[model samples]
Target chain A: SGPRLNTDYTSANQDSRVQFIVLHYTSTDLPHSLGILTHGGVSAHYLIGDDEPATVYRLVDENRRAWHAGVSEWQGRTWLNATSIGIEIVNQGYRDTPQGRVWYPFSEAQIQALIPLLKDIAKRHGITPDRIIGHSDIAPGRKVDPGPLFPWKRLADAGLVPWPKPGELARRLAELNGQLPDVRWFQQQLARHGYLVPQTGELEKDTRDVIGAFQMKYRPARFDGEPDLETAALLLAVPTS
Target chain B: SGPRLNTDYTSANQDSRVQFIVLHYTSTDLPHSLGILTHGGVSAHYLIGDDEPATVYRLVDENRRAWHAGVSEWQGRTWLNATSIGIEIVNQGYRDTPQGRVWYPFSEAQIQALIPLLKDIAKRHGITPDRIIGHSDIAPGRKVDPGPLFPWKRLADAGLVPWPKPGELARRLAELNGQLPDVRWFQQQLARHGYLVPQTGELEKDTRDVIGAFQMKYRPARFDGEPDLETAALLLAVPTS
Candidate 1:
């Protein structure tokens, strides 16, 4: 009676505070990845393993903050851990060899297991498709974990993230005719698509990383980070604006 | 003497204003490349064909501005056309196919011919070993010609560009233990080595591109643009600083 706490249930109508679903790669074997995620400083809401059965482990409660998003900024929001759910998928990531880089592909079972979990999380929290991103997307150069090898198109196909339409991409690519757009335009498109890229009108490293991150998500064949026409086409086709 | 321009023969101590030697790939056949260089707005000081004999053609005088380095910068200098010599080699840079990116390597004869010319140019301009760079090096994000497949180590072996000693690299690699130095340290080293990189303690894309450009020159095995211990070691071991 002294504080007079009252519940205004009739007037309140809101969704879960979660606005983003960040995906990551553990970059290690299943057991080692599990050990690190369980005891290390970094933690995620969920983890899907590359094992035969593709076990999905809930590492952290979705209602609580996870350390997965560190020093991250997306669109205008900074430090997204408070409002985001992270899912770590087990994979070796990569190893630089004399011939070239060797990147391990995510197991089909792992990706299949991840799809339902991602959908469940998105459905429960009302997280929009565009809000779903990779660890590299939120923190470009600081993290390249869920590297170019990550199959973002799988998630995009499930309506958990944005994917460029083939018709739109084809039309745009034809219009551009292999000649890339100006740096400012590319930066604008990238920034609009929720990357923390500068619109400095210069082909700076930050811009390239963001572009590379974007390409890793969209056009995974060759994310060379150069502002090529295909990259421009993808940039044009994706993003809300 | 009052109305005449001085034409002194003695006591001249000036050096060549040309400070950089920029390399490029024509991305076309020899005839088409020649046509473009001769009539097209873009021009280079020299052009090397992909023929068995690898004929070298002097397109523009070394003392004059070549339009090859348009809207480019290196170190702190912008508009490299004023202080640089550009050599365009006739090799179809690369092509993306359904399978993957297929890079066309410069012919053995082409590289053999280039070495002596590069040496002669270095001698005439007094251009330091570090100043010899590719088109992609100077205009990073905008260009990737003379790409990662370019045989830059061959030039290093010829004492044209600086090369890190294998023993030194091994020692440093062991000392670093695969753990890369901080981004600020990398930026400082890259900047000291004459790259236009920011010293802000963040791994930005511009820095990655610069590093990739460097790797394209020094470590042609892979230039994925990610900052790694090997890239750091190369940065440390190369430049005078």
Candidate 2:
């Protein structure tokens, strides 16, 4: 791409430079989150609240850089705020109860409102299926949001992103049988699917964290990061579009 | 306040210039709250986690400003971020269940850690007893964190703040009988006690909000905002030192 300052300013051929869309949970109440996003010096392009028939508040203009993605790298790019849009879903993230770590579920109404917003943004920016990611995906071990509870398959169903098919996952699991894949294989598959995993073949904490984050997105029911068969199958089945 | 500039002297003798201490509940897990505070541009001087031995992590230096207080006014001071220290205690603020609005209680361990932190900060900054406030106290109707469930008496017991004497409150209630004071009296008393209330005399929404915030701090058994005998008695009995 040349610095073609060739006075073609009137040409309607160029699209927006935005290439990715990052999703995040506001992790607080809508009003508090709105206060923070609007006046607290950090922002997102859009924020979807968990109210009945959820309200979408646009905080930053689409063309501006919202300070949502910080110290992030993905697909050979660093610091994605310059090239991506950020959407914050107002869910009070999660908490640790007497039972275990319990996550708050996104309301169906909130998701309903978000689907169209995602589609519109994607369509306008021409963001591909694989470029839609969670905040955890961009900064693996350091971040785990839009966390284990977020519905990735819902976005996939809307054709906004890709998901692993049940058939493909079942087939892969059957092929593996009771034998789980090696750490190296899991790492490789995770990397191929765009997670920053170590290819070291060692089950180190960093690798385990990345695996847990991957499991949080894919096999969310159980994400202990202990190289499980289901996690392996899901990793293998997610298409690299 | 004198602006003395000794050109050759380099010794700085200031303990943080913070004149107030505002408390809040993170309302999310440690990691998510940490992520938001650290990278999302909103911060606190200290964050006490909801762990068994609540860990206090100092995020922003006590001398710096944190983006916790938004659109707030306390005792004629508008926008408190410039002169206050913010302490974010990691407690899942509250939720509305089918039964009613359910609030989560702060852990004893968390409070144990917080008390000392409050004392130390107040001692350093010369923050008066009443200057230690909740997010609700400053922002009134807009924010409510470190909510009604928080133990305000505990702070009073430590001489950090004031609380109404039960005997005095009972005597006042007995004198008043079932007839409570008017909205104007409540508003004036609340304002004198450093709350942001409207002395409109008609019991407006803003006055009710301030009343609720006051009740949440003092007579927290019920904080519906409507002027009741108990709320009135407590408001009358609280000493403004």
Candidate 3:
């Protein structure tokens, strides 16, 4: 597997909801996944091969649209496939092997390959540090492709995402515990931070699923989606600009 | 229903953790409910009667601490009883109704009386529009007393709480759909807006529970404990300083 960019690009709606960047794992060996995505109607902008020193594949042009971000929503927008650029990384996903379950632990080479691409797209599309998303985000309960095994924090530590000090979120996490804080308040907070949550006072199943997806991304170590103290603190950490 | 305050009072902590007001429902009929709260161990600053026009009762003095906020967390602090004023309104909780399971709706009179009290508290404590929370928030999995049926947007319209225009939130709700925007971002936004959330990113069950709590307060209409595009956008609206 290697890095390849699609030169055959076309124009899009211009607003390029490219406001978001979605990440995913092919869930198969790099060569197999690449053929399926590139030749088969489904394709992403780039693919990362699982080699000691990873390989990159450019399936679609960055300036043009990539068929990745399929039916997705962030903030209030829907059908994000048209608005974002999708990237597929090759990995075995979470599967139990004879020795135990094997999770595609991202290698230095894989991440190193991702950084420059992320930076390039981010700069061109004006994607903020907080605007990066995952396939699970658009699909939530229906899709957990990029599971907890993903290395989201590494990207944060690399300054690709916004990282807050643990001390900062402690207070806000404590405030939400009450007989019941209003859900509209949470919706307002989510929207302010840039999620596609509705200002509904009651918690819906889909909403909970998205929360779980959020957990998988930034807090890769957890994904229960309960909205407990830590999750509340993390939610609070979202930048308000 | 009507409005009432309790004259009885007790100070658990010298300083209060909650500077805002939280509303709850007794879920029981009058007389007995009032007795249980007043003569009984549980007590609040005020109790609103669910009679025709709604009645008000005073139990605890406004200046002293009340036992309303029990083991609750909001915007980061814990044990909000020391800092917050608690109000209990009389109402039958979720039960089988003749038509079907119905949630008790707050009478105009009861809510009307509540506004002034909340406004007074807000002014005195300098509680910002985002500080007001509910019992479910403090104890999400444990309590749903002041369920989603509570009228929150209504309170905001009356100027007692902060309510941004619908269009305002709609415009900026597209920020949550990124490859890297995770629970940390969501928590950061919540904390920034005064939610007492923690930043550990444990992905523990309680973390999801609190996210649900935050969603319940801000984005009431939906419940999934998962942060979506809407949740992220709302987070941006209120940035914590």
Candidate 4:
């Protein structure tokens, strides 16, 4: 009895340790996607392939932190890999073309498979909808994944993400009326909404990148990192709680 | 059968993805130890307590990389949290007192408990003896855990560590004849032995810290980051294979 674990007790005040769900697009295809996440240097808690049926593979368990989210933060937390469940959907991420940047869309079956998995994780952990985030949102300039074509709006529909009130975005846009807030207002709003951004009030390169990350999530049509009236208005309307 | 897992085949060509076992001291005692590792932001694969029998808790599984070894490297590998097993011992790392710095020692029970676990992990993964290293060995300058008091020599005796041949250190020392090679030799040898050091020929602060980490493992008695004869001798003597 020397080496004993006390499993005979329970505490009512505690809940699960998982507080966040982060998503990614595996930057490769089929076997390479499976090979790398399982055999290569980085890992995620789950990987949904682009197969016809889009099979879900648990690469690393939910009880452990996988290495997918590198140098990340959200709200006041740093290094979110410690507290987040990472899901990587197999897609080529993006490739720049002469006309513009081209991105691959995740297979429909992949998204269908992912929704149940996401909801179960949230329900099991009591993870709030606000805690589900994209890799780009957490790391900004260093990472931009689950890119413009990735369907975060569907995640919102499935009750696994937060979004701005549709009318609230319109109201904020009209209220601003082409008179946008300065760089400092955008900076504060980004931080308040939980992307780690510089509040330097200078409209810097990194500040733009964070804004780009914000847009990729909320307003995916034009995520060029510019601080504009709609982007600023969306920031005002997006709720963190 | 839509979400299927194939467990029908086996391939002997692939060994375990685990390549290293890194040791750390939790820098706290007892329940705070369990409380933090179990509920805190960072985690390890395994945590052994300072309890009388030193019960071993599987905080994270061997199949998953845990959130230890931040910004770490070993044998040319960066961010070793991916392919490494982290084992944190319960000992308050160290603190500076008016007299000198004092470090807590691992309880006898804890070390005794750890030996079997180490062997099991090594045999299961086929992780070579050289790969079982201290936290300092991997992250040097940023981390110096399982500190000077750690019984690495005992691990060597248990066949889990590499050592200079019984007389090799002495042979190398005598051959040097009280004349030490320049900082460049130390830097090259440290690199060759798989510590990530700046290859610049100048003797720098970071260089000294890496050398100090080497000394802390082989000669803990006088580990003050000095580039001395014995350190140079020891560097020459350690085997990478």
**Candidate 4 regions off by >4 Å?**
A1-98, A102-110, A125-145, A157-159, A162-214, A225-241, B1-112, B125-145, B159-214, B226-229, B232-241
Per-model chain A TM: 0.94, 0.92, 0.79, 0.94
List, for all models, the DockQ compared with the true complex: 0.01, 0.01, 0.01, 0.07
Tens digit of lDDT per residue, candidate 1, span B128-239?
Answer: 8878888887787678888877777788888988777778777777878778788888789877877777677876778788777778777767787778788888876775
Q: Looking at candidate 1, what is the lDDT of residue A158?
A: 87
Model 1 scores a C-alpha lDDT of 0.75
lDDT of 1 by residue, A131-167 (tens): 8888898899788878887778888788878888769
iRMS of each prediction in angstroms? Answer: 38.6, 25.3, 32.7, 8.2
Badly placed stretches (over 4 Å) of model 3 are A1-17, A96-103, A174-184, B1-241
- Which ranges of candidate 2 are over 4 A from the true structure? A1-14, B1-241
Off by over 4 Å in 1: A8-10, A239-241, B1-241
Q: Model 4 chain B, poorest ten-residue lDDT window? A: B5-14
* Residue A136's lDDT in candidate 3: 79
Per residue, candidate 3 scores C-alpha lDDT tens digits across A13-70 of 1122246688888778866876777666677777777775666766665534466665
Residue-level error in angstroms, candidate 3, position B141: 43
* Clash count for each candidate, listed in order shown: 5, 0, 188, 0
A98-206: candidate 2 lDDT, tens digit per residue: 9978889899888888888888888876789899998998898788788887888898999887787759998988888889778899888878877777889999988
Give the candidate number with the greatest lDDT: 4
Better of 1 and 3 by TM-score: 1
A best-first ranking of the candidates according to their TM-score comes to: 4, 1, 2, 3
Candidate 2 backbone collisions, by pair: none
TM-score of each: 0.49, 0.48, 0.44, 0.59
